[PDB]
Design a protein around this ligand. Structure first.
Ligand code: GTP
Ligand code: GTP
Lengths: 438, 50, 100, 57, 62, 438
């Protein structure tokens, strides 16, 4: 119907999907057993879940996702936890070795012998589905093993299906914190692969997630549990359009047609406004005006860049809860007329609005509040250039001093692609600044 | 009183100076308008008179 | 050591030479509040437009405004460039002191 | 106040169309016939035709 | 071929503008006359001084 | 609509606002809970409270003020106090360092990292505002810390808001009591940095406040409870015209128009006439004649400036309670017939009346009597030339001996600015001279 198919890769990107389903079960009342109550929702599988679960004749919800990973540890843990019945067993595919952050080792030594199995799984789901608008890919640019493997998977998908769009997410390289030194290498490789086959790619950074958490959620010692809970809320908001209905409805096809102006550059940034602590929301006030002011406030954006230096291209926004077009238009007119917000003359307007009536739902034991006016903001800007500005000037030094080149050549790759990667990146910066120039 | 008001360029308080530089140029035209209005009005006056 | 003492006075004068010109930018670029700006008879003053009336050419005020803003920006850039050199030279001298 | 403006304008014998133009009463003379100033030729013709018609009047 | 040509971006100019000498309906024919009399401009049947938060020269879209 | 915003800087500037909101909450039925009696007065915030409390849907009156400071002691105290649940959670902004009374330190060393946050607070209040007539800035000239931040933030809010009014109350230097050696220095800096942006400034001499206190309130040991309560009543009087009705109503715009003759010199003085105690009120009578004469008494002023030394030019009478224009104008005629009073040849009339029917208030545990006829005497007079003369002939000595300047030069400023300040003060004083000449 209006359904998608999901792929998670990496001990980076598996627990995030785990949290995603921990959220997605409640709003359909999916008991961890997997079976619906005495309510007569079961049948062929037709109800709001019909976009994520194939509740086929067994009366059980089966997610339409696959977890591919190269280390049995975390996958065996999660399949021995509580949700093992909920997950499909061999929709969980696991290897026994890693790539040790090496893109090329994982792209040439291990990839050739599990791709057949995973393509078999995706075909066996694609047959039983009917519409299949697209896919939900999760990996990491700091991919210790997900990076190259996912690049090859995405190549094979691009060459097998050419009749739909793909959504890419990435926990981005932390600009000034680096947990890995193989990070610049695998990041540059993954980028200059993705740019020409990634349909719509999104970046987030976790340092600024920490910053959000201790600015307004005020929690001084959170964990991944909280971080991934926030990210799952984000993706839930972006697909609420498919989930429920409303006054006007939007779709990822419109997302593409209305966010990307031209070829290549298709790399927006997300933001979520109404994150707040319990007592704060308890005895303070919420409405469209202040939530919009906060969403455009420069420091709430979870990627370290300055909109004041930047200039915007386009802006899609999703309002979830209870809202009316009168306040909508008033507030958006004020924000249009605001002064600091620089808008390019190539766009007279840039605003794509969405309204949906279902309030977001909190996970039991969660950390955010009981909000009634949620909003996700998806903006395209020229403020993204700073990341590449930093990355190129790291890469040129570390690659002109060429450490670890022995490591990479020890398995069959060498510096040709290292040259064309930085050159593709250079083309990227020049086009960014050129289109930024009016 | 050492004079210094020749050209330089920085203008810390300039909006209001230019706003009042609009004042004489807006007034002069009104003065001309009232002059010609006077002559045409009196012409009309004794025309209708006879 | 004496030169290091000399340096700070010029440092202070040059640093003060930035705040007031950012202030000047702010005070020549309106309030950045359209909402209460009109109380100062928004640019296009009702009297000014009604003056226009038959029009026949208009005010050069926008041109002069842009002229001033541009000059401010140019001198901003020059001062920032020199500023960035300053501290590095200062601290290289300091490390030379330490080695001595 | 049209009356006071015209009398304080200087020239007393305004010609008033009818009255002869007294050569010394003319003080402040109008700006030249131009399309932009407050002396468009559309009125420049009209004052003349009205004056001569009132002459035959 | 002619192309539009505005000025740079500011924050003090309003998005729209009226041009009362072309927006007054009663004195329309007379002001049409002195438009040519001054020889200033009519040009395109459609222009505006303030298209959006910016301005252009007197020569309308040419 | 009709509302303003309150700004409080400096641990001097904190307990004053504390007592002010005490009086405010007492008078508008506000309880330490923050919710009214069972009477229906709760809504979107549209009634008498709407000028200083935004009692939003949470039912809690949320004050439209901000308290900032550099040292956490007093702010944590008022967090531990009784009213903290009323006070907004992070409307209390606190640094962790002092300023050594050094205006230069508080303007350059530390101010560059707090002005941004406070600007964010100010904008998020002004947006929910609708009318935004003005602010109420409370700092102190002899401020132990509130000098540099007050200066800088006042400058920046000027450059971001170019039209609205600014009201600035300060404590003046004590002409014969010096609790701070560099206070004259801080004073001259504040003056020549603020006069060109400050809109309406009032001063007050706490020595003369105490003098009034033991003159007619006949207690030989008053305290800050009393000293703050009096000025709180004063501000209640000045905002009464907005809070209640009257035969004629005046506004701060009228204040600035008819109270300042010329640009530059914009420094009026206040006085409260019926500063009388329980027993004297209880067995002595009240009426317009004696209240007027009392307010025009040459000694009950809170600033040492003898009118006979000075000369008047402006007077604003504000009568609150029950009162009649008949004897109002009769009494003002009598005062004009009095010859001691000296109104310059420039102003034949300089008098503005303002009437409110509503009578002012007592407070539980109050030190004041039961007032029925109340008056603010707000007058502008030339009597403050000596005030600047005393401080200039103080300051010139310390500069000619250049004492203590090593602190300032170490923190990072220079001396041509002091030179400009000294000549500015000389210019102001000579201007006082010519305007004194008739
Ligand atoms: N996507 C995702 N990334 C995470 C998460 N937690 C941390 N990260 C970051 O993502 C990176 C994980 O990538 P890798 O370590 O290369 O994972 P991998 O390629 O699957 O293989 P390994 O080398 O065995 O981990 C780390 O550098 C972390 O900084 C998470 O929960 N999800
Ligand atoms: N506003 C106010 N001022 C007071 C009060 N009590 C005393 N003062 C006077 O206000 C001045 C306080 O200045 P400071 O002590 O420097 O206050 P500050 O600059 O904010 O910083 P600190 O020195 O850290 O307190 C003193 O000179 C007192 O004479 C009061 O309760 N309220």
């Amino acid at each position: 119907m209006r359904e998608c198919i999901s792929i998670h890769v990496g001990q980076a990107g598996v627990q995030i999907g785990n949290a995603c389903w921990e959220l997605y079960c409640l709003e359909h009342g999916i008991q961890p057993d997997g079976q619906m109550p005495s309510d007569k929702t079961i049948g062929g599988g037709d109800d709001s879940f019909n976009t994520f679960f194939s509740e086929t004749g067994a009366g059980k919800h089966v997610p339409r996702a696959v977890f591919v990973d190269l280390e049995p540890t975390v996958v065996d843990e999660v399949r021995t936890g509580t949700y093992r019945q909920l997950f499909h067993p061999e929709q969980l595919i696991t290897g026994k070795e890693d790539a040790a952050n090496n893109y090329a080792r994982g792209h040439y030594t291990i990839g050739k012998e599990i791709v057949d199995l995973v393509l078999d799984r995706i075909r066996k789901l694609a047959d039983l589905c009917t519409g299949l608008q697209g896919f939900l890919i999760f990996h990491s640019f700091g991919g210790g093993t997900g990076s190259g493997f996912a690049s090859l998977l995405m190549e094979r998908l691009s060459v097998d299906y050419g009749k739909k769009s793909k959504l890419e997410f990435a926990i981005y390289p932390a600009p000034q914190v680096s947990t890995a030194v193989v990070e610049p290498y695998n990041s540059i490789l993954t980028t200059h692969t993705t740019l020409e086959h990634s349909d719509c790619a999104f970046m987030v950074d976790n340092e600024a997630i920490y910053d959000i958490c201790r600015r307004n959620l005020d929690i001084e010692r959170p964990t991944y549990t909280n971080l991934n809970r926030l990210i799952g809320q984000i993706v839930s908001s972006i697909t609420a359009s498919l989930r429920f209905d409303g006054a006007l409805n939007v779709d990822l096809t419109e997302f593409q047609t209305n966010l990307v102006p031209y070829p290549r550059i298709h790399f927006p940034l997300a933001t979520y406004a109404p994150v707040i602590s319990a007592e704060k929301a308890y005895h303070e006030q919420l409405s469209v005006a202040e939530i919009t002011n906060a969403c455009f406030e420069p420091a709430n954006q979870m990627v370290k860049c300055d909109p004041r230096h930047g200039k915007y291209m386009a802006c899609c926004m999703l309002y979830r809860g209870d809202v009316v077009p009168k306040d909508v238009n008033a507030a958006i007119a004020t924000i249009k007329t605001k002064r600091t917000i620089q808008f390019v003359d190539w766009c007279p307007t840039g605003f794509k609005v969405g309204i949906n009536y279902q309030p977001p739902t909190v996970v039991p034991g969660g950390d955010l509040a009981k909000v009634q006016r949620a909003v996700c903001m998806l903006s395209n800007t020229t403020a993204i250039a700073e990341a590449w500005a930093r990355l190129d000037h790291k890469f040129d030094l570390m690659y002109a001093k060429r450490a670890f080149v022995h490591w990479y050549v020890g398995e069959g790759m060498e510096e040709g692609e290292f040259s064309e990667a930085r050159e593709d990146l250079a083309a990227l910066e020049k086009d960014y600044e050129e289109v930024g120039v009016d | 009183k050492p004079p210094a008001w020749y050209a330089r360029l920085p203008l810390p308080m300039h909006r209001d100076a230019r706003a009042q530089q609009t004042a004489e140029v807006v007034h002069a035209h009104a003065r001309g308008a009232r002059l010609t209005a006077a002559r045409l009005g009196r012409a009309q006056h004794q025309i209708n008179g006879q | 050591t004496m030169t290091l003492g000399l340096m700070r006075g010029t440092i202070h004068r040059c640093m003060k030479f930035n705040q007031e010109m950012y202030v000047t930018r702010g005070i020549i670029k309106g309030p950045l509040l359209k909402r209460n700006l009109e109380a100062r008879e928004k640019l296009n003053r009702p009297l000014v437009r009604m003056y226009q009336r038959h029009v026949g050419t208009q005010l050069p005020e926008a041109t002069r405004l842009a002229q001033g803003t541009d000059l401010l920006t140019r001198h901003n850039l020059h001062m920032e460039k020199n500023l960035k050199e300053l501290r590095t030279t200062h601290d290289n001298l300091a490390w030379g002191l330490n080695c001595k | 106040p049209l009356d006071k403006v015209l009398e304080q304008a200087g020239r007393h014998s305004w010609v008033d169309i009818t009255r002869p133009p007294t050569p010394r009463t003319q003080g402040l003379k109008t700006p030249p016939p131009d399309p932009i100033g407050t002396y468009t030729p559309a009125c420049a013709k009209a004052l003349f035709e009205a004056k001569r018609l009132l002459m035959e009047s | 071929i002619h192309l539009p040509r505005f000025s740079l971006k500011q924050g003090m100019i309003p998005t729209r503008y009226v041009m009362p000498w072309k927006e007054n309906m009663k004195f329309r024919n007379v002001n049409l006359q002195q438009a040519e009399a001054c020889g200033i401009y009519a040009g395109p049947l459609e222009d505006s001084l303030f298209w959006g938060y910016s301005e252009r020269l007197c020569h309308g879209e040419d």
